[PDB]
Design a protein around this nucleic acid. Structure first.
Lengths: 122, 117, 264, 64
RNA sequence: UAUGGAAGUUUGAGGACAGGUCUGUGAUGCCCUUAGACGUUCUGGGCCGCACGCGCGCUACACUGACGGAGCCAGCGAGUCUAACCUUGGCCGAGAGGUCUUGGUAAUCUUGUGAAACUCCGUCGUGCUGGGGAUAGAGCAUUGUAAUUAUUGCUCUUCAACGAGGAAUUCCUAGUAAGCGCAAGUCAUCAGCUUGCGUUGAUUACGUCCCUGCCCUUUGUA
């Protein structure tokens, strides 16, 4: 029944603590986001991380990957209206790191200010 | 893959300018550049058409020395060359198609770095 | 504050000697009228004083009759820097200061173009409203430079790895740049075990004369050890010495736990 | 509990005159996480008298 | 004369000049520099730039606590005329903000400025932890011609050191220190600025010359 720290989406998501504050350790998701998704998982917030079997995990991750259809009104996601396509993404642990990393490159190729700041600044 | 502006490709990259190009753009463009009613011909529209008209047969268009940094890159100046005066002489910058959604001021750097070494 | 780098250059030939002329008499006559400069032409001395009185290297008392002077805290400064340049050192000041509390760290250019550290000794840096002129800023801070200066030279002669004093004249001590970084600001280092094994044994080095450092806590020395702010040390004759032993050690037993995680 | 300490602690500690929120952490038990809930239940179920009612400092009794 | 006294510390606490005025004159003299070198003006940039040393601050290292509800408690203020300030109310939107009408040139309306700390009841449990939000990105807003070198506001994400601070030093004797917010001035936007205002509200002497710095006596002599 009791399960502690788990390894999925490449991150050692901690056990034995409050349910919201386990997910926040993942890059790209935080206190409000792990709050609201734990509301949208239809799981109580006073439950701990010792619970949450695999199906309860699959509902959470299932919601977060398509957040606009499980009632998130597209003002709550982190990286909305991408400059590539126009869609609304919520970038996650290693999508967020290279997603935010490549933006420097797309401001270097165009020769924008901030990219050149980080170019000659290093 | 070409420059999908925000899900916008080539023909409607070239003409949606100033009417509905400003519509699908971020917050500093839409209602913000419901304003931007400035002297946009200046010596800009005439050199914008004559200077890109001054690219015959695989050639840089004629660089425009100008006195602006604040103008957002328009879809008509896609593939232009513009000198951007940054406190010293008209420092020539080519315009690229991926440059839309940015300021003319962000390319010509005004200050030099501190240069230790 | 009290010190100034501006006017050093613009004095003329006789000046340094005229500004010296008050100094030899100073030890005997500590109030020096105008002709008392002459013996040691009729253009020479006051055009120097016109500098020295208006450039504040000599104080002035106003009277109808000839006026007695007594040399100014500012005036020894360049007189020092005169013999300083004349031993050899201090071609120019450096752009990195270096401003401390009681002492002035100055990147300074010795002959050969050696960037090095100058230290001007005078206390309570701000010139202070509360001082009696001629002694407190000069003469107290004058002696005390050599008091420290010949300690380090004596303490470096011991052989412990420390800074070596280069030059001292008239409350100015110059020594090595001693690059390294203090542990007060310490950022990262991997190997403590012999580092601190040196440290706690560096103490019995400090204690090899029957002395104890008392500044050995943080903000003193750098990864070469490079150690500074020596003067506070305590003798074996010094009565309370045993209390200060665990003070020094344990405070650096303290530090490592937080930052670099080591325990003896 | 973590394996057994519901049944274990619920027999182990009505020891002293006074239990509280932070006294239960002294005995190297579960922290104020769930032992505070355990104060609500055993407060409720007869054992310790609520001579407080509330949060941070909750003055209580022994098993009476 | 401790007593009584609102108050027994001055009740208490404050409110002629080598000063400025030839740059004030709508009084009154002397000496200096002149034309490709006397100016007007447009646009852009900077006044933010950073190995740094020095100094004023703000916020932190929490469990006398962080967060979520709920209680709802002041004073100083100040506001639109030849024009759009303060804004109630009514909608819209998470929010920022936007819209439609109102009152107040003001003890009246904003506004009882329904402020904050605070209080109660909950979770959190000693873990760089949920303290902390450094820095940076996305989107959405407002001002202003213009915010790019990030104005400021909002939403999400990213979570830096700091585990109580060395030698040194600043300030302070009662509704005061400290903590808390508010108004006004600068002002198209903009406090972390200043000057006032009230709310919660200590400890510790009530003296001394150890230092510090200042006043004031006596002393020696050109």
């Amino acid at each position: 029944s009791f399960q502690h720290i788990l390894r999925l989406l490449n991150t050692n998501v901690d056990g034995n603590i409050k349910i919201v504050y386990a997910l926040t350790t993942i890059k790209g998701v935080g206190r409000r986001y792990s709050n609201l998704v734990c509301k949208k998982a239809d799981v109580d917030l006073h439950k701990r991380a010792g619970e949450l079997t695999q199906e309860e995990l699959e509902r959470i991750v299932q919601i977060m990957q398509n957040p606009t259809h499980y009632k998130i009104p597209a003002w709550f996601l982190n990286r909305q209206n991408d400059i590539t396509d126009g869609k609304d993404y919520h970038t996650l642990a290693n999508n967020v790191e290279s997603k935010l990393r490549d933006d420097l490159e797309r401001l270097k190729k165009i020769r924008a200010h901030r990219g050149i700041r980080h170019f000659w600044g290093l | 893959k070409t420059h999908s502006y925000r899900g916008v490709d080539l023909e409607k990259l070239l003409e949606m300018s100033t009417e509905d190009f400003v519509k699908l753009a971020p917050a500093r463009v839409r209602r913000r550049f419901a304003r931007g009613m400035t002297s946009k011909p200046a010596g800009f529209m005439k050199k914008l058409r004559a200077a890109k008209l001054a690219a015959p047969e695989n050639e840089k268009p004629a660089p425009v020395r100008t006195h602006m940094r604040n103008m957002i890159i328009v879809p008509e100046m896609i593939g232009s060359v513009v000198g951007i005066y940054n406190g010293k002489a008209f420092n020539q910058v080519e315009i690229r198609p991926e440059m839309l959604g940015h300021y003319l001021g962000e390319f010509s750097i005004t200050y030099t770095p501190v240069r230790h070494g | 504050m009290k010190l100034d780098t501006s006017h050093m250059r613009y004095l003329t030939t006789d000046d340094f000697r005229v500004l010296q002329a008050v100094e030899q008499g100073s030890r005997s006559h500590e109030v020096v009228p105008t002709p008392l400069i002459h013996q040691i032409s009729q253009s020479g001395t006051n055009r120097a004083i016109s500098d020295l009185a208006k450039l504040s290297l000599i104080s002035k008392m106003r009277n109808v009759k000839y006026d007695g002077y007594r040399l100014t805290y500012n005036g020894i400064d360049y007189l020092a820097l005169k013999t300083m340049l004349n031993r050899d050192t201090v071609y120019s000041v450096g752009n990195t200061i270096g401003v401390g509390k009681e002492s002035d760290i100055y990147k300074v250019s010795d002959k050969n173009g050696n960037p090095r550290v100058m230290k001007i000794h005078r206390l309570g840096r701000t010139y202070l409203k509360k001082s009696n002129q001629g002694a407190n800023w000069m003469h107290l801070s004058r002696l005390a430079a050599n008091k420290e200066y010949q300690f380090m030279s004596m303490l470096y002669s011991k052989g412990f790895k420390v800074p070596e004093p280069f030059d001292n004249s008239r409350h100015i001590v110059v020594m090595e740049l001693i690059e390294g970084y203090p542990m007060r600001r310490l950022r990262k280092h991997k190997n403590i075990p012999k580092l601190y094994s040196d440290l706690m044994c560096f103490i019995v080095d400090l204690a090899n004369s029957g002395l104890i450092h008392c500044d050995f806590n943080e903000f003193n020395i750098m990864i070469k050890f490079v150690v500074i702010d020596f003067p506070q040390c305590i003798s074996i004759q010094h009565q309370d010495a045993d209390y200060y032993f665990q003070r020094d050690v344990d405070c650096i037993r303290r530090f490592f736990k937080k930052k670099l995680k080591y325990e003896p | 509990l973590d394996q057994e300490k519901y049944d274990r602690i619920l027999k182990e500690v009505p020891t002293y005159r006074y239990v509280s929120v932070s006294v239960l952490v002294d005995r190297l038990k579960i922290g104020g996480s769930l032992a505070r809930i355990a104060l609500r239940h055993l407060e409720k179920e007869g054992i310790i008298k609520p001579i407080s009612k509330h949060s941070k400092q909750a003055i209580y009794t022994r098993a009476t």
